[PDB]
Nucleic acid binder design. Sequence first.
RNA 1: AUUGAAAAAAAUAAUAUAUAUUAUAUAUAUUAAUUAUAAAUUGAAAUAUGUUUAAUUGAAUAUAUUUUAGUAAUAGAUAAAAAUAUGUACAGUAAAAUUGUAAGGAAAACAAUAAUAACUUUCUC
Lengths: 104, 348, 240, 274, 113
Amino acid sequence: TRITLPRRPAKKIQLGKSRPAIYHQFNVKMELSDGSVVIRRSQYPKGEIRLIQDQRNNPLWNPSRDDLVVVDANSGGSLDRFNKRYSSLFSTVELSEENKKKTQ
Amino acid sequence: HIWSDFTTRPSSLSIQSSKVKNYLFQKKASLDPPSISRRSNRIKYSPPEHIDEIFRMSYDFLEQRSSKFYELANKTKNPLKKDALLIKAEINNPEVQYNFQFNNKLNNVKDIIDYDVPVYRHLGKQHWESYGQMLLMQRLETLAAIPDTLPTLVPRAEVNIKFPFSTGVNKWIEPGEFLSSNVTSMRPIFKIQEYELVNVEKQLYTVLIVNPDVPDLSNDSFKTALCYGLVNINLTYNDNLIDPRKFHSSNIIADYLPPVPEKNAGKQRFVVWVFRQPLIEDKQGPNMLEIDRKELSRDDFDIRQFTKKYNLTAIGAHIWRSEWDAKVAAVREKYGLPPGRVFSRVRR
Amino acid sequence: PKIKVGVLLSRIPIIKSELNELEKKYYEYQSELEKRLMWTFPAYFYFKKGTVAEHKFLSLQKGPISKKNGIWFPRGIPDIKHGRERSTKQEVKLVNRPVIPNDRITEADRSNDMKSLERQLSRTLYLLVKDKSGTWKFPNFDLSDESKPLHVHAENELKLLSGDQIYTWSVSATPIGVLQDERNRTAEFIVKSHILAGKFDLVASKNDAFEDFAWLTKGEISEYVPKDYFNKTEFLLADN
Amino acid sequence: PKSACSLVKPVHHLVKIDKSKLSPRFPELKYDKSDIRSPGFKPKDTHADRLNDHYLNTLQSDLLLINYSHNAAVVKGLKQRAWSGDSPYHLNRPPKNPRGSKAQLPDIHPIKWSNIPGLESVVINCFVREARENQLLAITAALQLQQITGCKPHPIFSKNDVPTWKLRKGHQMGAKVELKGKEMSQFLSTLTEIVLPRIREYKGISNQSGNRFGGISFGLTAEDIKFFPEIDANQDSWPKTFGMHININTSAQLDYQARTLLSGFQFPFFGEEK
Amino acid sequence: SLSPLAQRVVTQLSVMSASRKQPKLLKLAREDLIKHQTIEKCWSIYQQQQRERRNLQLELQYKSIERSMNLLQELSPRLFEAANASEKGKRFPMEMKVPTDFPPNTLWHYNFR
RNA sequence: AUUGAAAAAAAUAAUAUAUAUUAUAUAUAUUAAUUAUAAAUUGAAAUAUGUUUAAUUGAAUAUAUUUUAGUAAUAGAUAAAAAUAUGUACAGUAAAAUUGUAAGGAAAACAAUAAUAACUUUCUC
């Protein structure tokens, strides 16, 4: 019932002729949420990449900072449309109007 | 820049080829490797990129270290410490490494590898210990040359042997090798290379070739025979090839008699031992010793008693093997020996 | 003898340390060896058949020289597999604005500001203060209550000194060194700690022992501090 | 064969013989793997290492100070007990097992300038149980490991036969990889800097985790593996991705020292410690 | 006859394999071999010196710790016990981050909590 | 040899040529390859005369020849997953139990679990 691809007769790699494995890697630049950049070795042919969510904008790794904005992927799903759809209500008036319910 | 100086440093601490020196110390990658003789191959070759400036900086670093070592060596007094510091100073020299790695170490040329120099002596010791000494000890142990002749051996010198006069061909005998009676008919020559601090002006050496396999029917066993013996021999780090040029009849305590095995008498082992004589102080000149030739047995030899009596310490050894063939009778006739005995095929 | 509590506040490097010329050259040489012994790039897996990305990658790349009968190739007959000449290294060229790294040298670097916490982003800074005399030395405090440990005393004293503008973390309650004296019969105990956020900003104006402050590294500390004090405190400071 | 009787003949000298040097065979295996003449040559130090440099510059001194204990002494571990010689039957009797354990335990030395804790290796374990029905998932897992880490993966093969789980023996169920030096430094750096922050509800590593003699283990799921740069770059080539365990082996004499070291490398911890 | 999944995994294992991807063996002249030997010896010596300098610094620091502990023990046992109190549960601050190779936009933060 | 460029080298080994010895040795010469092996109209390269093009050059089109792609595991003298049960040479040490770790639980897979006095080489005060 199992599916497997057949084993071909392995080529014999003689004693002393066995070379190491050096896969092709690029010196890729990786930008964090802040302006910091780290050079690293990657096998993907992309020399440059930036991150939107990472260590530099996580509360657990950033306890001391007072203000810390969070963000997610853009142009995907229906995110932020729950705000774009309602323009009449906008940002402290709602906070004041949410004072109490007076129910018991 | 001490490595560029040669006022006191021996001239052998430099690459004698101007082309290779210039290529190794080149400023820009404009030259080509002299090792690659064919131009075609020189054009095909491509040296690793960014290799000459890193080489210059590593050279400078190592040379500063060597200069410090020379500074401390010029002030040390104990000869052992002086030699050790010299070795540590010149061990990392690219020129020394080039010379030793890519020039002969056995038939060394004084101007490339000089064994008067501590660094070359140390590199030679390392090279010998890598391959040659291990093979020698394996052959001695496996062929049972150690316990049969002498209790043990702590190798401290490289001994090579050859039979140049017998046939006319040139070959250093591999230890434990089988040689024909014709090959070993005439005489062996030795080469004893020393790698330790030894006073060349006082030290003397002896060499004994013995066969601990000559049958003895009185007790149905074997016995040892002194094939060859020389005493009071002086060597030098670069001139240490013993041959009838470098010794007299007074050095010969037993003229050479050839390997002459008997038919069905088994494979006989001829073992070479090199000893260094005692080194007495407070006295000038080499300390020569007289061998009691009326006590020397020459056919019922006892090597352990001999060395114990004359206070000798072994520093090197070699061995070959012999067995009967057709030329044994001719050798016997040529050396004036009686016709050989013939023993049974079965060991009962 | 009277007990005294000293503290050395350190700012850790913010960026990777600089490389000496030997390190730089060794690294580039080894990198070129690696590139020479490097595998072929398997573009057939990172760019699928007939796709625009594959087309543009191929356009970017420059092909090798193929072997053809009737020609002479002085460097050797080409031996290519998967598009690389096996006898040489292989070079591959490759809200979306390009990555522009920030300069490693700051306005504080160029203005030689001795107080800003940016004078060396790659080195380790250490807080030094000036007493009434002309001898820079690490901050020291007296204590007689003895109801609190050395590091707690140091932290509270630094907080009060900076006027609630320094955030400091104590590495350990264990003192890191001692300085003895005979004339004043005082034993001064040092405690290690790091700076996390804020600014020092000496506040007290009633002429405490502290007069002027600086954020020097090891070499500048050697140049500023007395020789004996440096011999007695040097090993407590990090080289980089 | 006349007999099966192993026996090593004694020697008459102190010279150590290695027969690999006396055999003319295998000339290229005589070179060390660090020697440029060896086909096994691979350049080691190609670039500086931020994590190692940080640990050498800052964390060694702090760890020494933290772990200092005045006039401390070695705490010997559970070792095999010896029979008191009050009965003759104790003459050649094998020693007893350690009091509480069937295996001996190591001694704990005080922390000193020569034995500060540090990272020594990282091992990633990927056992795809669903590979029992499909052998190709093992290859996919190996590629996941290679892309994440950059080292050569090694296959994992089934060893036990468990019917309830339908696990046979002798089949390829996944892949493993061991990391050292700059490569493990990079793997940990990328983990902490990119992947762990992108987990949904991540509090850290359990404070009651790790073998009792230094070493901390924690896992990652498939969705967590999707956060690595290589997978995100080419999502198309990753219809399915597999989780894995991560085992960090350090020089720590005990586990809490390793926890402090990893916290220095920015690894959060949430649970209550033993 | 193979499936598209089979082709995909064969491509993945092609990326695995070393077949038709490695270059020729690196053969160096004798002179360049000697150059490389000197490079490696220099680097090895250098790294040994760096390691030993760090080790000496830690030795000196440990000596300082023990001298200070002896002094504090004999001067005030209360402070000595407070110092010798264990830090079994200690963790490093979460913003004592490992250095990166290019600095961030806001170099330092001057406010907290 | 030609081919970017003005005395020749002095090692182990390998290859080519040659001749010494009832000695698998010596002399000169050079320093190749070391992951490969048929079959591909269809993917990708390099090679000419018009070309548009500025001495070139160039980038793009057309064809003739050739090259790459058959994309396949071990890269370690591998070492207690499954496969070669007889020879020889080299080399190594299992097993349980305990503590942890995504799914994982009693039971899947990985990691860790006895002591360094003495002897070397290296670095360093």
